[PDB]
């Protein structure tokens, strides 16, 4: 059409990035994230981003959705940090959980200045990078999961 006359005239702009960066400041889960090399994991629980304790990292409920931030030193500089952000979608996760995990992955990306590379990891379709995150035998799928945040309209 004529993009400039339209409701998408400001897509792709610095302004769009600025507004979304500000929104990402209002999620407590990101405070302190990505500050050292390692893996940080959160689970979506009724729309909220909830930390997974380190002792459970690598075990994932098949009924749930998760965000996994892998912080590492890039080849270009052994003293600075780069990021892969994976969102893991269990085979039985509900639509609210997967949609929140996707949205909040983008938000964590925003919070980290756009630097993370995003990976969608459906159970049974996990990328080679995702498989490499956990020590031998470390990736374990657990039965069940937390209840959906949706109210079911009858």
């Amino acid at each position: 059409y004529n993009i400039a006359d339209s409701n998408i005239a400001n897509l792709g702009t610095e302004l769009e990035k600025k507004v979304k960066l500000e929104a990402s400041q209002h999620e407590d889960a990101w405070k302190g994230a990505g500050k050292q090399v390692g893996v940080e994991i959160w689970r979506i629980q009724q729309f909220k981003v909830v930390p997974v304790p380190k002792k459970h990292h690598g075990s994932f409920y098949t009924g749930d959705s998760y965000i996994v931030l892998s912080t590492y030193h890039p080849k270009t500089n052994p003293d600075k940090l780069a990021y892969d952000v994976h969102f893991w979608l269990g085979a039985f996760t509900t639509q609210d959980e997967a949609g929140t995990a996707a949205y909040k992955t983008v938000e964590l990306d925003d919070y980290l200045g756009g630097l993370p590379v995003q990976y969608r990891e459906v159970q049974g379709y996990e990328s080679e990078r995702f498989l490499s995150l956990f020590p031998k035998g470390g990736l374990r799928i657990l039965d069940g999961g937390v209840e959906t945040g949706f109210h079911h309209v009858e």
Binding site: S6, K20, T100, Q118
Partner: protein, 363 residues
């Protein structure tokens, strides 16, 4: 505080509450007035009384063209359907991409100045559908009653240079079915008859995998024919109209448009994106909206995109069963997130900035 999510389709209002898994109110986006020239009726009641009314849609091709009647639609949604006080509810609205800027400016003005909402946001429909599918990267084909749009999205950001739009969707297909049914000697002309034909289309139409083969099948025997009982009790029969009607999506020249069909436009949108992301778009074509509900459409899209794309390209069409509601559902999810709501326009911000603020907050 519960947000309201209202997806104002060209054809149907889908409205309800953030955090619900489906819209609680779904009804025709129509105002009816006496066909012989309270004094008006809205929604389901207009439909129920269409024997005596002329029906008008305030939204045409995704754009509000009758603001007074659109206000009646919104008033009906809040007060008669959902039975809420709009001044108590932050409200999420939706729009097709590539609409003129003034459309959302006036949406914003009416929501704050007439309905006194405490906060609001206007989202692009295809973006909501992608999140409803659990993705941050993919290309959405959204087709309702007014607009067919293609939006490629990478890592959560829509790529504006590659967005496509066709003002050809369900209402044009209904009108075409009305036209071609005259070949059988049927006469569907009035606004009430348009609604009958819309129902015929929804119940009996399908997309042929190979259009020319299907035309030959239809002439060889009656195997593809179906019957349909009109509201007056007359039973009609339709044959190749079942698949000629939606063929128009692939061949817009059926209605005299020179446009590329929906397969070619999807391909063209992908081809406007950086080469290194195209494989991810081809593997993540997500369909949303009622006009994507024809039986056979996903298989036809798969076939046509395969013929256009490089011979080794992995192509996948994702066609969620609830895709008549995917936009609404994505809105329900995002409006349940406090950080998404942090971006919404507040009443105070509107009072100080006016309608222009919508372009600085809603992306």
């Amino acid at each position: 505080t519960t947000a309201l999510v209202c997806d104002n389709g060209s054809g149907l209002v889908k409205a309800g509450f953030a955090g619900d898994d489906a819209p609680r109110a779904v009804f025709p986006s129509i105002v009816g007035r006496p066909r012989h020239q309270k004094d008006s009726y809205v929604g389901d009641e207009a439909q129920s009384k269409r024997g005596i009314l002329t029906l008008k849609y305030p939204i045409e091709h995704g754009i509000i063209t009758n603001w007074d009647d659109m206000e009646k639609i919104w008033h009906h949604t809040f007060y008669n359907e959902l039975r809420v006080a709009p001044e108590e509810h932050p409200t999420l609205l939706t729009e097709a991409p590539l609409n003129p800027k003034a459309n959302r400016e006036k949406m914003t003005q009416i929501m704050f100045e007439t309905f006194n909402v405490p906060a609001m946001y206007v989202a692009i429909q295809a973006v909501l559908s992608l999140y409803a599918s659990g993705r941050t990267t993919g290309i959405v084909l959204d087709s309702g009653d007014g607009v067919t749009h293609n939006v490629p999205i990478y890592e959560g950001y829509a790529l504006p240079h590659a967005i496509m739009r066709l003002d050809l969707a369900g209402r044009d297909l209904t009108d075409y079915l009305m036209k071609i049914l005259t070949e059988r000697g049927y006469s569907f002309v009035t606004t009430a008859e348009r609604e009958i034909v819309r129902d015929i289309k929804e119940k009996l139409c399908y997309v042929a995998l190979d259009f020319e083969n299907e035309m030959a099948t239809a002439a060889s025997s009656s195997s593809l024919e179906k019957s349909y009982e009109l509201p007056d009790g007359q039973v009609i029969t339709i044959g190749n109209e079942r698949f000629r009607c939606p063929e128009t999506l692939f061949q817009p020249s059926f209605i005299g448009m020179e446009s590329a069909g929906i397969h070619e436009t999807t391909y063209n949108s992908i081809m406007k994106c950086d080469i290194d992301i195209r494989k991810d778009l081809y593997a993540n074509n997500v369909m949303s909206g009622g006009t994507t509900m024809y039986p056979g459409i996903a298989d036809r899209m798969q076939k046509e995109i395969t013929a256009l794309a490089p011979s080794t390209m992995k192509i996948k069409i994702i066609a969620p069963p609830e895709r008549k509601y995917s936009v609404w559902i994505g809105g329900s999810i995002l409006a349940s997130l406090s950080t998404f709501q942090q971006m919404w326009i507040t009443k105070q911000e509107y009072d100080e900035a006016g309608p222009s603020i919508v372009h600085r907050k809603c992306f």
